[PDB]
Structures are given as structure tokens and as C-alpha cells.
Amino acid sequence: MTYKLILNGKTLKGETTTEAVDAATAEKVFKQYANDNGVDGEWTYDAATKTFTVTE
């Protein structure tokens, strides 16, 4: 399933797209890379736009 997350860290700003079976896996995959990249804090996501959102 096509999935995109906006990595809006405090200073680390970056947009990213990816794939995954469901949204839970995408969020996990995004969370990992986001965490791996040192990005996390706020975690928002919508099903209408089908896009993920994060911010520190």
C-alpha cells in the first residue's frame, strides 16, 4: 500500500514516501527510519489523505 510521511523534525525537515501491506507496518517502517534518523515526538496520520505526519 503506497504510504508517505512528512518528517518535520524540529530542525530535521524531510519528506519521504514508502510502501507496506497495511498502515501499521508503514507507520512502523516510517517510525523506525524516523527514529533511526533521530526524528519523532509528535505522530499524526489520517486515512482520508492516506498520508503520515510527524514532528518534534
From Swiss-Prot:
It is found in: Secreted, Cell wall. Sequence repeats lie at residues 2-56. It comes from the Bacteria. Binds to the constant Fc region of IgG with high affinity. This is Immunoglobulin G-binding protein G. It comes from Streptococcus sp. group G. The chain holds residues 228 to 282 of 448 of the full protein.
